Amino acid sequence: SSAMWFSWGVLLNSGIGSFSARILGMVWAGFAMIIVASYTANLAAFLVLDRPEERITGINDPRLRNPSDKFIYATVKQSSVDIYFRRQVELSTMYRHMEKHNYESAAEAIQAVRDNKLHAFIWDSAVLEFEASQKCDLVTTGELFFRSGFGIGMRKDSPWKQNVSLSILKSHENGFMEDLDKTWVRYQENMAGVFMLVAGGIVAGIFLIFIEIAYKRH
Amino acid sequence: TLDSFMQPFQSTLWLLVGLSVHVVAVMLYLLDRFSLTLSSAMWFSWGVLLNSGIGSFSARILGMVWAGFAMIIVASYT
Amino acid sequence: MIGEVVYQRAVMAVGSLTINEERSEVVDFSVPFVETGISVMVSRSVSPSAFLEPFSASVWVMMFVMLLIVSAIAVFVFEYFSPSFTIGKAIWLLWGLVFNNSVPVQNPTTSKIMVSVWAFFAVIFLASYTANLAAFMIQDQVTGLSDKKFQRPHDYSPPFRFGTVPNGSTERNIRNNYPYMHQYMTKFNQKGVEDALVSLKTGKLDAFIYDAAVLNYKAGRDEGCKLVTIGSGYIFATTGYGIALQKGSPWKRQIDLALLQFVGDGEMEELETLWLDIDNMAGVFYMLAAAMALSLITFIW
Amino acid sequence: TLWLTGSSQLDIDNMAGVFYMLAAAMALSLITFIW
Amino acid sequence: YTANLAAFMIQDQVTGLSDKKFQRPHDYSPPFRFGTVPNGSTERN
Amino acid sequence: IVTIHQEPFVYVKPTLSDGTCKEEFTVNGDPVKKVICTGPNDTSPGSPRHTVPQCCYGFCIDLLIKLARTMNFTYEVHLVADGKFGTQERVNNSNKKEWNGMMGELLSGQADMIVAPLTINNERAQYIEFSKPFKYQGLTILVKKEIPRS
Ligand SMILES: *[C@@H]1O[C@H](CO)[C@@H](O)[C@H](O)[C@H]1NC(C)=O
Numbered sequence: 001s002s003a004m005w006f007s008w009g010v011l012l013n014s015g016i017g018s019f020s021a022r023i024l025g026m027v028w029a030g031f032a033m034i035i036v037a038s039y040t041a042n043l044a045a046f047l048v049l050d051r052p053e054e055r056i057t058g059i060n061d062p063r064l065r066n067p068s069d070k071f072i073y074a075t076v077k078q079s080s081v082d083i084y085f086r087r088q089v090e091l092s093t094m095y096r097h098m099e100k101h102n103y104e105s106a107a108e109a110i111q112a113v114r115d116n117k118l119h120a121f122i123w124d125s126a127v128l129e130f131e132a133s134q135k136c137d138l139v140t141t142g143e144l145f146f147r148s149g150f151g152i153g154m155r156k157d158s159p160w161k162q163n164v165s166l167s168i169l170k171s172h173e174n175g176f177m178e179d180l181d182k183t184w185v186r187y188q189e190n191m192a193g194v195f196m197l198v199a200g201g202i203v204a205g206i207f208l209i210f211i212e213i214a215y216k217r218h
Numbered sequence: 219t220l221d222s223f224m225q226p227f228q229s230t231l232w233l234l235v236g237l238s239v240h241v242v243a244v245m246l247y248l249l250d251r252f253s254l255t256l257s258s259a260m261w262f263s264w265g266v267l268l269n270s271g272i273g274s275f276s277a278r279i280l281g282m283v284w285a286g287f288a289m290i291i292v293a294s295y296t
Numbered sequence: 297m298i299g300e301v302v303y304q305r306a307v308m309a310v311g312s313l314t315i316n317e318e319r320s321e322v323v324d325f326s327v328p329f330v331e332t333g334i335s336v337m338v339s340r341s342v343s344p345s346a347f348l349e350p351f352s353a354s355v356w357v358m359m360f361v362m363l364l365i366v367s368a369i370a371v372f373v374f375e376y377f378s379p380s381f382t383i384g385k386a387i388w389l390l391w392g393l394v395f396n397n398s399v400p401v402q403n404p405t406t407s408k409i410m411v412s413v414w415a416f417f418a419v420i421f422l423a424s425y426t427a428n429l430a431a432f433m434i435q436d437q438v439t440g441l442s443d444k445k446f447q448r449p450h451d452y453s454p455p456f457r458f459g460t461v462p463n464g465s466t467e468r469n470i471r472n473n474y475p476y477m478h479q480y481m482t483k484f485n486q487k488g489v490e491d492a493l494v495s496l497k498t499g500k501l502d503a504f505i506y507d508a509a510v511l512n513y514k515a516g517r518d519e520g521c522k523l524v525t526i527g528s529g530y531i532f533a534t535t536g537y538g539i540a541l542q543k544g545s546p547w548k549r550q551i552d553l554a555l556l557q558f559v560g561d562g563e564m565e566e567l568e569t570l571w572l573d574i575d576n577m578a579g580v581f582y583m584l585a586a587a588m589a590l591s592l593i594t595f596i597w
Numbered sequence: 598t599l600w601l602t603g604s605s606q607l608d609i610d611n612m613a614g615v616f617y618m619l620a621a622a623m624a625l626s627l628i629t630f631i632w
Numbered sequence: 633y634t635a636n637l638a639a640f641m642i643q644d645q646v647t648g649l650s651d652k653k654f655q656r657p658h659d660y661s662p663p664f665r666f667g668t669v670p671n672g673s674t675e676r677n
Numbered sequence: 678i679v680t681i682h683q684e685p686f687v688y689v690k691p692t693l694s695d696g697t698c699k700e701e702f703t704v705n706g707d708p709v710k711k712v713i714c715t716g717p718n719d720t721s722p723g724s725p726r727h728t729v730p731q732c733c734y735g736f737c738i739d740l741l742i743k744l745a746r747t748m749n750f751t752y753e754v755h756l757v758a759d760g761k762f763g764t765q766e767r768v769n770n771s772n773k774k775e776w777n778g779m780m781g782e783l784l785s786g787q788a789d790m791i792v793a794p795l796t797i798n799n800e801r802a803q804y805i806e807f808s809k810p811f812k813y814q815g816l817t818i819l820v821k822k823e824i825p826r827s
């Protein structure tokens with residue numbers, strides 16, 4: 001049993017221990033060092049890999065442009081995003097599949113996405129980033145497209161449009177918008193498993209094997 | 219590439235680790251005195267760091283802190 | 297340009313001017329087409345620690361006491377295996393297998409297979425940490441005007457020097473929000489953007505404050521990308537450029553519709569694209585501290 | 598552009614190396630025994 | 633060696649129409665099969 | 678005023694037995710302004726819609742309060758009955774354009790001012806005038822984010 005213990009100690013480096021035996025040991029050690037070096041290199045190469053799917057760079061990704069049943073994404077309803085998609089006649093093929101996955105409210109669509117019902121959801125950057133900050137299980141992809149702004153909708157006959165614009169400009173100048181953004185929008189196991197398992201196994205074995213050997217000897 | 223075997227920048231770490239070896243060696247010698255004169259401790263440090271088969275308070279500190287120093291050095295090298 | 301428009305010398309004006317409170321009250325602007333604002337440009341310069349709390353195991357307590365507790369259990373069982381100093385020798389058994397360079401390893405049963413498996417786990421952990429460090433090398437301090445440096449430039453021994461371009465809106469904003477900072481910055485004015493940029497590149501000015509669009513363009517066009525803006529999202533009051541028109545002109549009504557059609561048809565993104573170590577030293581210090589602690593423990597032992 | 602758009606492991610080489618090194622070790626042991 | 637193995641792991645059977653398989657597939661043990669759409673330029677060529 | 682239900686902008690919570698809602702405070706301790714708002718109980722179609730009162734608060738209501746304070750206005754916040762922003766959609770006799778949702782309510786005279794996270798659009802501007810945009814943003818993609826695991 002000593003020979004196989006020494007062989008395992010050579011393979012797994014933990015210090016466990018005529019001419020033909022010596023040369024066999026030389027060859028075994030030279031083989032084992034190469035094997036462990038190659039195994040470490042292979043493990044290092046394997047660990048550096050993007051297991052999750054690549055993040056969506058933007059609208060130019062062919063995955064979004066080409067619709068598929070394995071990856072379904074759509075807007076909420078006939079909102080400004082729907083108007084933007086309708087104006088640009090370039091993605092009707094995915095528009096056909098987008099028309100089949102509408103939702104009553106944006107919150108319902110976000111909840112469905114959290115439940116993995118929808119692979120992706122297209123909506124405003126501010127709402128999506130707020131949801132990502134509040135809910136860590138959701139993330140935002142895509143840099144910027146269809147950039148616009150939020151305005152106070154008023155009818156044409158309203159005579160205070162200029163006053164509203166001046167008030168908005170003054171609020172921006174005074175930093176009120178920054179304060180509101182800070183107050184509202186600007187919010188906040190395998191590795192442990194293996195070590196716990198090996199620690200428990202070793203602390204159990206150091207007693208179990210010893211009592212078994214004592215029983216066998218007795 | 220790979221020509222920066224010694225150090226890319228801030229090469230003083232190679233002297234700092236040698237100073238650490240020297241201070242742990244003199245501490246081991248002092249412990250041995252309070253219980254192997256000049257080159258024993260440094261040779262043991264090289265053996266435990268560069269594996270070559272080399273190897274009361276002095277023995278305890280040799281078995282305790284040399285292992286940690288070697289593991290830190292090999293982790294830094296990796 | 298605003299005075300030219302007001303005096304009926306021009307009907308429309310597009311000169312990358314920004315929307316301001318005192319501008320919209322004398323002339324009428326259209327819907328903005330590009331986002332801009334007030335930003336700060338700062339110089340742009342493995343820094344994160346490896347095999348430590350920031351690298352992995354942010355809790356940092358259980359992982360580093362696992363070795364201690366398993367060593368204590370090994371000492372206890374070695375003392376129990378009676379049917380030298382057990383406390384000062386059984387620790388070497390566990391500390392001799394955590395790394396694969398330990399020569400003093402004396403293990404005279406299946407416990408040998410167990411310690412071999414533990415050594416395999418340790419080398420797997422080392423390889424995983426090395427691979428993670430190989431992939432952990434891909435990589436702003438003002439964090440907005442609320443920082444104490446902007447409020448107290450003279451607080452530090454080296455004065456913090458900013459820059460601004462007069463005949464503009466940034467000076468108006470700093471005057472209307474930080475009059476003392478505006479007075480301080482008036483002593484370090486620059487006649488143009490290029491002089492401020494080259495002063496920042498040469499280190500004459502610690503930071504420069506100007507329009508967000510021009511600052512971002514200069515940061516992108518800077519040689520070596522040595523100058524960058526203040527992160528992303530820390531911008532000041534965000535406005536647009538628009539086009540200046542005389543109040544009551546009948547052209548703005550269709551101009552806003554045309555601009556919205558352009559921005560909604562993708563006629564803006566294409567234009568935008570076309571036109572715009574320490575860890576080792578810390579580890580050595582920690583190892584020295586651990587060596588001192590172990591020496592004290594051995595003296596107590 | 599729009600119309601025309603779009604690890605490693607211990608393989609059999611390691612097993613062959615294991616076989617070759619085992620054969621070489623056996624041959625060396627036999628030679629030493631004969632010598 | 634570890635660095636070389638890590639760098640090296642970052643990595644066509646007919647190599648064109650001049651292969652022997654197209655000229656005479658019956659000289660190979662597997663029944664190599666190639667096809668083309670008729671009424672086209674390929675058959676004329 | 679007519680507003681749409683958007684969590685980052687207009688938080689909507691049901692009222693208590695007294696017709697009001699709980700008073701909360703921010704991290705800094707400043708009071709959270711809340712208004713009495715009326716809206717449908719169920720957003721889904723084919724449901725017994727009831728104009729029950731709620732409390733709607735957030736960025737949009739704060740902006741509305743600031744505008745009313747500056748301009749001495751007396752606002753009256755209302756929620757969209759349809760629960761949608763509303764655009765030009767095809768209906769029976771498809772050769773006809775009609776505005777629904779919040780935009781339709783505004784164009785029908787029911788509403789007087791819109792304060793909501795509504796983007797500036799060419800179709801919107803052809804019938805509804807908009808002031809300067811108080812917030813600049815774009816569009817992104819929301820995708821489920823698995824926890825990073827080795
Ligand atoms: C707009 O503001 C001015 C103050 O400059 C005021 O005189 C005027 O009555 C206001 N108009 C409306 C419709 O509120």
Ligand SMILES: *[C@@H]1O[C@H](CO)[C@@H](O)[C@H](O)[C@H]1NC(C)=O
Pocket residue numbers: 462463486487488
């Ligand atoms: C315009 O800027 C220049 C320096 O760039 C300054 O000398 C001049 O006084 C400014 N104009 C006015 C009216 O202050």
